[PDB]
């Protein structure tokens, strides 16, 4: 190519978007934003395929242009905005607040939260830049730059920031025993506490996470998102938090539910 591409084929779209095959050739390429193209969820998918408030892409354009949708407190009018992990979607017309959290599987969820919980979010620190005049900065996973942070915040910890003020209210120290959520790599959606952090100098550090039912697993350091201090989460966990019931365990759960329904 001679420059940046602007289209996205539907079959080449991420599998977790749950897009069909015979509806169209192109998929909505998520516009540039805080979250990556492969690790986000466009606003058009969330309103048409998840909430089903709009049946076409033109209706999503009318919904967003009336200044109804607002991500992280700021009103958005881009139907292809990359709404990612821990982002808050507020609909003041219906009084609904959504937070994009992964399923028990590797897919996003329609997880409705309350108004008091929609006032904040969780952001994972990526780097700590020392700007001019020795002013430290915090680079979160959503490109948010926060000046003058708590000196105890490190390169892999999470912080609880407000959406209206934009400042840090509290934070969770990244260490063993704290609750964490996997953000990719065959464990997307599993929730558990940290048990061991293997350090490989010169390559990726793999940590070991153990869920509540004891099914320990592992993943790289770049996929762990601390969501709670110890065993208590700071955000509302989705139904089916991180158990990851096997295909055999889910079958018995479905059959016993159909007989009871």
């Amino acid at each position: 190519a001679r420059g940046p591409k602007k289209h996205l084929k539907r079959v080449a779209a991420p599998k977790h978007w749950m897009l069909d095959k015979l509806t169209g050739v192109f998929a909505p390429r998520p516009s540039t934003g805080p979250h990556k193209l492969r690790e986000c969820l466009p606003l058009i998918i969330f309103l048409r395929n998840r909430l089903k408030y709009a049946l076409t892409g033109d209706e999503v354009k009318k919904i967003c242009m009336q200044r109804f949708i607002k991500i992280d407190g700021k009103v958005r009018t881009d139907i292809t905005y990359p709404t990612g992990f821990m982002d808050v979607v507020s609909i003041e017309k219906t009084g609904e607040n959504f937070r994009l959290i992964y399923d028990v599987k590797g897919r996003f969820t329609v997880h409705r939260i309350t108004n008091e919980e929609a006032k904040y979010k969780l952001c994972k620190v990526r780097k700590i830049l020392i700007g001019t005049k020795g002013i430290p900065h915090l680079v979160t996973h959503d490109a948010r730059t926060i000046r003058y942070p708590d000196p105890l915040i490190k390169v892999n910890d999470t912080i609880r920031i407000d959406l209206d003020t934009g400042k840090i209210t509290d934070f969770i120290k990244f260490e063993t025993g704290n609750m964490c959520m996997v953000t990719g790599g065959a464990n997307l959606g599993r929730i558990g506490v940290i048990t061991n952090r293997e350090k490989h100098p010169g390559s990726f550090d793999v940590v070991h996470v153990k869920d509540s039912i004891g099914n320990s697993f592992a993943t790289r350091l770049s996929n762990i998102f601390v969501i709670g201090k110890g065993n208590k989460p700071w955000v509302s966990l989705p139904r089916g938090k991180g158990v990851r019931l096997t295909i055999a365990e889910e079958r018995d759960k479905r059959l016993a539910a159909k007989q009871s329904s």
Partner: protein, 180 residues
Amino acid sequence: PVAKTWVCSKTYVTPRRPFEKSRLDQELRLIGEYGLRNKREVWRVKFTLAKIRKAARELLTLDEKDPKRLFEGNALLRRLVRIGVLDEGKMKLDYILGLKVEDFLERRLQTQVFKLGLAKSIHHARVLIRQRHIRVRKQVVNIPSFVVRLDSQKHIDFSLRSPYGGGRPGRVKRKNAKKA
């Protein structure tokens, strides 16, 4: 680039021996006994059995208590008992290798409507299915190869608009009544 899938698989396979006398007799015997149209419907139901036997034969290779064998094995067994081709008494992975092509041919729609007394013969059974006469649970079926399952066994009856059941007469019944 179009929004199509281009997926399509065949349902039968031609034998290696084209004029094997021992094969032509047993295939023609299946056609007349079940009222089939051609040899393709015989090779299709043989190819259907071959896929199930090959799927079970792969599971017999895997050892017991295997998460893949227990899941896919129980799913295949309950799927065969659902359509009625496999009994509930002995549902094991080794009894799938003891299935015959006649077991599937007995679960067709033309043979079930014949066994239920709704049709005179097996050939009379196929002609009324294609003429929108019988249904299954308020659903009119026009296909004789409808694989009836056990949940829809006691729901096969004539449609609510056919003269055989309760409905208006045919085009030739009132035609003869008008002329005389």
